[PDB]
């Protein structure tokens, strides 16, 4: 329940999604020493980083396709303007 309202506020519909409750460490040493990163958090980080790399690659590939498109239209333009003799 409440997923619709959470989306309205910009939060994840399920509290178990992206949030401080899930992402943040759940404990720390009494001495104050920071706790080791959670295996799930590290696992989740790897997938998020991998997806980000895919986004960069796809955007870079799309950028090349956009430029290479114009480059192909520059070859036609120069081909049209030709002379001899």
């Amino acid at each position: 329940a409440g997923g619709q309202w959470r989306l309205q506020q910009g939060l994840a519909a399920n509290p178990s999604g992206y949030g401080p409750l899930t992402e943040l460490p759940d404990w720390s040493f009494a001495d104050g020493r920071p706790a080791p990163p959670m295996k799930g958090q590290l696992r989740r980080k790897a997938q998020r980083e991998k997806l980000a790399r895919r986004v960069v690659l796809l955007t870079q590939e799309m950028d090349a396709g956009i430029q290479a498109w114009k480059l192909r239209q520059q070859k036609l333009q120069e081909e049209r303007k030709k002379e001899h003799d």
Binding site: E61, M62, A64, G65, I66, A68, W69, R72
Partner: protein, 78 residues
């Protein structure tokens, strides 16, 4: 079987969501010409790895250590 009010709303929501899908599919960022060959290099490289992996089958090697290690089963206190 008279239709419950809840069911009608759910179907309407699905249609409305599908309508949004139509709109976001109505603006192709890249034209047909640009798409051609944009991923050609990647596809060629991927298939080469597939062929190399596919044709890598062979029987496995045999080592002396396997036969010699079996003799260790007789180890005991001195």
């Amino acid at each position: 079987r008279t239709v419950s009010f809840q069911a009608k709303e759910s179907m309407i929501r699905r249609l409305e969501v599908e309508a949004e899908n139509h709109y976001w599919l109505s603006m192709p960022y890249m034209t047909a010409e640009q798409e051609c060959g944009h991923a050609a290099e990647r596809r060629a490289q991927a298939f080469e790895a597939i062929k190399a992996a596919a044709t890598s089958k062979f029987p496995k090697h045999r080592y002396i250590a396997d036969q010699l290690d079996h003799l260790n089963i007789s180890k005991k206190w001195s």
